[PDB]
Amino acid sequence: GSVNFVDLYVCMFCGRGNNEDKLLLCDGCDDSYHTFCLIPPLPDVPKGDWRCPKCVAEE
Amino acid sequence: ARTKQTARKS
Ligand SMILES: [Zn+2]
Ligand SMILES: [Zn+2]
């Protein structure tokens, strides 16, 4: 949406001045999750379809 | 995956 509200995406507690580059936002529950903080057994920056363990859990 | 790096257009 608007880039003005892009800084509101920071990992739960974690995410300040850190790995923010590898930071993901899961469409639907999309506030924040670092690829190694809480993601599938796959911690990498994905290059395909992204969704968190919980959202993939109910499709 | 959408990242902080991508989302922003600098
Ligand atoms: Zn984190
Ligand atoms: Zn999700």
Side-chain angles (χ1 to χ4, degrees):
Chain A
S2 186
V3 64
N4 181 31
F5 293 86
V6 73
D7 187 87
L8 297 300
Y9 305 114
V10 184
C11 182
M12 296 176 181
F13 299 98
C14 165
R16 299 179 59 186
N18 291 26
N19 301 269
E20 300 184 85
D21 301 272
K22 303 187 182 300
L23 177 60
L24 277 44
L25 61 166
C26 173
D27 298 276
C29 84
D30 55 271
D31 179 270
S32 63
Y33 296 116
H34 280 143
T35 59
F36 59 85
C37 294
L38 193 176
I39 243 73
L42 162 62
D44 293 270
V45 59
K47 303 178 66 180
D49 56 89
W50 155 251
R51 282 183 176 169
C52 76
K54 293 175 176 298
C55 287
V56 302
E58 57 172 88
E59 295 301 279
Chain B
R2 189 180 181 183
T3 54
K4 296 283 288 184
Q5 177 177 270
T6 62
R8 299 185 60 177
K9 305 300 300 183
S10 179

